[PDB]
Amino acid sequence: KDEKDHLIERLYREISGLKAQLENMKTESQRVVLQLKGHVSELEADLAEQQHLRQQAADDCEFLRAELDELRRQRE
Amino acid sequence: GVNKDEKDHLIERLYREISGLKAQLENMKTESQRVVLQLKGHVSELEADLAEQQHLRQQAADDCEFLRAELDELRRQRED
Incomplete structure (x- = not known):
């Protein structure tokens, strides 16, 4: 047989x-997944900061x- | 014969x-779309929570100002 050969x-x-294609997708998919993971982790650290800053600001007003x-009770 | 079956095999x-x-390609891209979608949703919920923290920070600042x-x-009015 030939044509089978071709x-x-x-x-x-x-x-x-x-x-x-598999190797490419596997590696590119893993890359995208990892940077997304880094971003949410970065956002969690940002949030904790903002919550701290915000907690401090709110206590200031309470104070x-x-x-x-x-003061107003000094003439009540 | 000439090698016909071996090639069909x-x-x-x-x-x-x-x-x-x-x-495999299908199963990989289906799985990937599933993970990426969940991460992107988490990102935007985190971003939403950051936005709300700034709103309340602002609100506390206006409140303190007041x-x-x-x-x-009240002290100014009393020093007279």
Whole structure:
């Protein structure tokens, strides 16, 4: 047989294309997944900061609220 | 004979390998889309929570501004 030989050949070329595709997708997918993971981790650290900063700001007003009540009670 | 069946045999094996390879590709991209989608959703929820923290930070700042302006003036009015 010949023509089978050329199909063989083409199938092997096809197989090579597909295995190359898997490796590419595997590696590119893993990359995208890892940078997304890094970003959410970065966002978690940013959040904790903002929550700290925000906790401090809110307590400041509570403190001021009490200081104001105290002042006005000095003539109540 | 001339080698006809042996080539038909291999051709079949190569058909099977190709089909296995395309099933892998499908299963990989389906799995990947699934993970990426969940990560992107987490990102935007985290971003939403960052946005709300700034809103409340701003609100506390305006509140302090008000409180401090009240304090300053009530004393001002009393020093007369």
